[PDB]
Design an enzyme around this catalytic site. Structure first.
Site, PDB file in Angstrom:
ATOM      1  N   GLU A  17      -3.455  13.730   2.057  1.00  0.00           N
ATOM      2  CA  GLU A  17      -4.578  13.164   2.782  1.00  0.00           C
ATOM      3  C   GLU A  17      -5.292  14.294   3.458  1.00  0.00           C
ATOM      4  O   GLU A  17      -6.450  14.526   3.148  1.00  0.00           O
ATOM      5  CB  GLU A  17      -4.124  12.102   3.764  1.00  0.00           C
ATOM      6  CG  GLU A  17      -3.735  10.818   3.008  1.00  0.00           C
ATOM      7  CD  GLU A  17      -3.873   9.572   3.832  1.00  0.00           C
ATOM      8  OE1 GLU A  17      -3.544   9.627   5.015  1.00  0.00           O
ATOM      9  OE2 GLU A  17      -4.330   8.536   3.299  1.00  0.00           O
ATOM     10  N   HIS A  75       1.832   9.275   1.302  1.00  0.00           N
ATOM     11  CA  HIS A  75       0.632   9.119   0.458  1.00  0.00           C
ATOM     12  C   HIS A  75       0.827  10.027  -0.772  1.00  0.00           C
ATOM     13  O   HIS A  75       1.258  11.143  -0.626  1.00  0.00           O
ATOM     14  CB  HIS A  75      -0.655   9.494   1.242  1.00  0.00           C
ATOM     15  CG  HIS A  75      -0.756   8.766   2.555  1.00  0.00           C
ATOM     16  ND1 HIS A  75      -1.478   7.606   2.711  1.00  0.00           N
ATOM     17  CD2 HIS A  75      -0.132   8.978   3.732  1.00  0.00           C
ATOM     18  CE1 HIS A  75      -1.320   7.146   3.939  1.00  0.00           C
ATOM     19  NE2 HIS A  75      -0.488   7.944   4.573  1.00  0.00           N
ATOM     20  N   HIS A 134       4.062  11.197   6.548  1.00  0.00           N
ATOM     21  CA  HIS A 134       3.679  10.861   7.904  1.00  0.00           C
ATOM     22  C   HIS A 134       4.835  10.185   8.564  1.00  0.00           C
ATOM     23  O   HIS A 134       5.235   9.068   8.156  1.00  0.00           O
ATOM     24  CB  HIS A 134       2.504   9.869   7.876  1.00  0.00           C
ATOM     25  CG  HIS A 134       1.252  10.457   7.256  1.00  0.00           C
ATOM     26  ND1 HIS A 134       0.162   9.709   6.882  1.00  0.00           N
ATOM     27  CD2 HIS A 134       0.946  11.729   6.965  1.00  0.00           C
ATOM     28  CE1 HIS A 134      -0.775  10.506   6.416  1.00  0.00           C
ATOM     29  NE2 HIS A 134      -0.301  11.733   6.407  1.00  0.00           N
ATOM     30  N   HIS A 161       0.757  -1.271   0.000  1.00  0.00           N
ATOM     31  CA  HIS A 161       0.000   0.000   0.000  1.00  0.00           C
ATOM     32  C   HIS A 161       0.781   1.310   0.000  1.00  0.00           C
ATOM     33  O   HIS A 161       0.217   2.340  -0.349  1.00  0.00           O
ATOM     34  CB  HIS A 161      -1.133   0.047   1.039  1.00  0.00           C
ATOM     35  CG  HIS A 161      -0.698   0.001   2.473  1.00  0.00           C
ATOM     36  ND1 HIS A 161      -0.843  -1.132   3.251  1.00  0.00           N
ATOM     37  CD2 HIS A 161      -0.296   0.979   3.321  1.00  0.00           C
ATOM     38  CE1 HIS A 161      -0.456  -0.870   4.491  1.00  0.00           C
ATOM     39  NE2 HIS A 161      -0.138   0.410   4.565  1.00  0.00           N
ATOM     40  N   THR A 183      -4.681   6.498   8.965  1.00  0.00           N
ATOM     41  CA  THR A 183      -5.499   6.677   7.771  1.00  0.00           C
ATOM     42  C   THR A 183      -5.584   5.428   6.919  1.00  0.00           C
ATOM     43  O   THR A 183      -6.169   5.440   5.829  1.00  0.00           O
ATOM     44  CB  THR A 183      -4.959   7.824   6.962  1.00  0.00           C
ATOM     45  OG1 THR A 183      -3.592   7.551   6.665  1.00  0.00           O
ATOM     46  CG2 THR A 183      -5.042   9.158   7.800  1.00  0.00           C
ATOM     47  N   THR A 184      -4.981   4.347   7.419  1.00  0.00           N
ATOM     48  CA  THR A 184      -5.167   3.039   6.851  1.00  0.00           C
ATOM     49  C   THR A 184      -5.781   2.136   7.916  1.00  0.00           C
ATOM     50  O   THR A 184      -5.590   2.359   9.129  1.00  0.00           O
ATOM     51  CB  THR A 184      -3.816   2.407   6.460  1.00  0.00           C
ATOM     52  OG1 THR A 184      -2.910   2.579   7.546  1.00  0.00           O
ATOM     53  CG2 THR A 184      -3.244   3.123   5.256  1.00  0.00           C
ATOM     54  N   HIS A 240       6.288   6.976   5.902  1.00  0.00           N
ATOM     55  CA  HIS A 240       5.784   6.534   4.616  1.00  0.00           C
ATOM     56  C   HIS A 240       5.136   7.761   4.018  1.00  0.00           C
ATOM     57  O   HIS A 240       4.976   8.800   4.705  1.00  0.00           O
ATOM     58  CB  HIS A 240       4.727   5.422   4.763  1.00  0.00           C
ATOM     59  CG  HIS A 240       3.584   5.809   5.645  1.00  0.00           C
ATOM     60  ND1 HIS A 240       3.640   5.687   7.013  1.00  0.00           N
ATOM     61  CD2 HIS A 240       2.393   6.409   5.370  1.00  0.00           C
ATOM     62  CE1 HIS A 240       2.519   6.168   7.550  1.00  0.00           C
ATOM     63  NE2 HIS A 240       1.733   6.573   6.573  1.00  0.00           N
TER      64      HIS A 240
HETATM   65  C1  LIG Z   1       1.199   0.178   9.269  1.00  0.00           C
HETATM   66  O1  LIG Z   1       0.416  -0.486  10.263  1.00  0.00           O
HETATM   67  C2  LIG Z   1       1.266  -0.910  11.339  1.00  0.00           C
HETATM   68  C3  LIG Z   1       1.646   0.300  12.195  1.00  0.00           C
HETATM   69  N1  LIG Z   1       1.573   1.522  11.380  1.00  0.00           N
HETATM   70  C4  LIG Z   1       2.077   2.679  11.797  1.00  0.00           C
HETATM   71  C5  LIG Z   1       2.733   2.639  13.179  1.00  0.00           C
HETATM   72  O2  LIG Z   1       2.037   3.722  11.145  1.00  0.00           O
HETATM   73  C6  LIG Z   1       3.072   0.125  12.724  1.00  0.00           C
HETATM   74  O3  LIG Z   1       3.347   0.370  13.897  1.00  0.00           O
HETATM   75  N2  LIG Z   1       3.954  -0.304  11.826  1.00  0.00           N
HETATM   76  C7  LIG Z   1       5.367  -0.526  12.167  1.00  0.00           C
HETATM   77  C8  LIG Z   1       5.643  -2.029  12.246  1.00  0.00           C
HETATM   78  C9  LIG Z   1       5.331  -2.850  11.169  1.00  0.00           C
HETATM   79  C10 LIG Z   1       5.582  -4.215  11.241  1.00  0.00           C
HETATM   80  C11 LIG Z   1       6.145  -4.759  12.388  1.00  0.00           C
HETATM   81  C12 LIG Z   1       6.458  -3.938  13.466  1.00  0.00           C
HETATM   82  C13 LIG Z   1       6.206  -2.574  13.394  1.00  0.00           C
HETATM   83 HG   LIG Z   2      -1.141  -3.310   2.250  1.00  0.00          HG
HETATM   84 ZN   LIG Z   3       0.028   7.706   6.430  1.00  0.00          ZN
END
Ligand SMILES: COC[C@H](NC(C)=O)C(=O)NCc1ccccc1
Ligand SMILES: [Hg+2]
Ligand SMILES: [Zn+2]
Ligand SMILES: [Hg+2]
Length: 256
Positions: free
Chosen positions: A103, A93, A116, A61, A195-196, A91
Site C-alpha cells: 500500500e 494487503h 499492518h 477483503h 486504508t479501508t 492483516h
Molecule cells: C477492520 O475494521 C475494523 C477495525 N479495523 C482495524 C482496527 O484495523 C477493527 O478495530 N477491527 C477489529 C475488530 C473487528 C470486529 C469486532 C471487534 C474488533
Molecule cells: Hg469486506
Molecule cells: Zn491494512
C-alpha cells in the site's frame, strides 16, 4: 458494497466515505529523499512476547488475525508515540503478481505485500472510542518481498485452507507475531488513516524500512483465498491494496 474491483474499488470509495478525499489519507508514497531524520524520536518498543491470539477471520477483503486486547500484553510504544497502544489484529494487503501488492510505496517502489499490525491508544478505553480520536491508533507497517520463506508466517499460511471464503473463521491461538518482524526497527512515520473504509483519519503510521522475505509458495496461498462467500462464484482475493494518496503537506520523518 465497497471492494477492490472496477465497480466498487478505491476510485469509488469517496461516494459513501467522503473522507477518502481527506487531508491525512493513507497509504502514501515514501519519498526517501524528502523524509527527514528526526532527533526527537524515542526508540521504538514492540513488546509482543505476551501476545494472545484468538482467531483468524476472512472478512471478504483480507484476513484478520485477532488478539485478546482486554489486557496490556502485545503493546507498541516509543518512536513518535505518546503512551501505550495495544495490538488488536493484523492483516495483509497483497497483489496478484509479485510486482504489486503493498500500500505504501518507497520512492514509487511497490512491494509484493504489506502487513499492518493495528494498535489502539489505551487512554481511550477501547478500539471504538479510539477511532474517534486523531491519535487513537498506531499501525506498524511491514513490507513483504518474495525470496526466502518466512518461518514465522507458515502457521498463518497453513490455516488459510480453512477460511477460504468470506465469513469463515478458525481458531488461531498461541500465534507469536514476533515471528513476523524484520531484524531492524528503522522506520518512517507520518499521520494518516486506515486504508479501508471507513478510512478513519486516526492513525500514527510507523513503516519499517527493512522488508521481510516470504517465499513464492507462501504468497501463492494468500492468492488462493476468496473475496466471495461459500457457494458463490469464485473471485480470487488478490489486489486488495489501496494505491498511494496525496501527502498534502504532511511530513514523513525517518528514525534513522
Ligand atoms: C477492520 O475494521 C475494523 C477495525 N479495523 C482495524 C482496527 O484495523 C477493527 O478495530 N477491527 C477489529 C475488530 C473487528 C470486529 C469486532 C471487534 C474488533
Ligand atoms: Hg469486506
Ligand atoms: Zn491494512
Ligand atoms: Hg480519528
Amino acid at each position: 458494497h465497497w471492494g477492490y474491483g472496477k465497480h466498487n474499488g478505491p476510485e469509488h470509495w469517496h461516494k459513501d466515505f467522503p473522507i477518502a478525499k481527506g487531508e491525512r489519507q493513507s497509504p502514501v508514497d515514501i519519498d526517501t529523499h524528502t523524509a527527514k531524520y528526526d532527533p526527537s524520536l524515542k526508540p521504538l518498543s514492540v513488546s509482543y512476547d505476551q501476545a494472545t491470539s484468538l482467531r483468524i477471520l476472512n472478512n471478504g477483503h483480507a484476513f484478520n488475525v485477532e488478539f485478546d486486547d482486554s489486557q496490556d500484553k502485545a503493546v507498541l510504544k516509543g518512536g513518535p508515540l505518546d503512551g501505550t497502544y495495544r495490538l488488536i489484529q493484523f492483516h495483509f494487503h497483497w497483489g496478484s503478481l509479485d510486482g504489486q501488492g503493498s500500500e505504501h510505496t518507497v520512492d514509487k517502489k511497490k512491494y509484493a505485500a504489506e502487513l499492518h499490525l493495528v494498535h489502539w491508544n489505551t487512554k481511550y478505553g477501547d478500539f471504538g472510542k479510539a477511532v474517534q480520536q486523531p491519535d487513537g491508533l498506531a499501525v506498524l507497517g511491514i513490507f513483504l518481498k518474495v525470496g526466502s520463506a518466512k518461518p514465522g508466517l507458515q502457521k498463518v499460511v497453513d490455516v488459510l485452507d480453512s477460511i477460504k471464503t468470506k465469513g469463515k473463521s478458525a481458531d488461531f491461538t498461541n500465534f507469536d507475531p514476533r515471528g513476523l518482524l524484520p531484524e531492524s526497527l528503522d522506520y518512517w512515520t507520518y499521520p494518516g488513516s486506515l486504508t479501508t473504509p471507513p478510512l478513519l483519519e486516526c492513525v500514527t503510521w510507523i513503516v519499517l524500512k527493512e522488508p521481510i522475505s516470504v517465499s513464492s509458495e507462501q504468497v501463492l496461498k494468500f492468492r488462493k483465498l476468496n473475496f466471495n462467500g461459500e457457494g458463490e462464484p469464485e473471485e480470487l482475493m488478490v489486489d486488495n491494496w489501496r494505491p498511494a494518496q496525496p501527502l498534502k503537506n504532511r511530513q514523513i520523518k525517518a528514525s534513522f
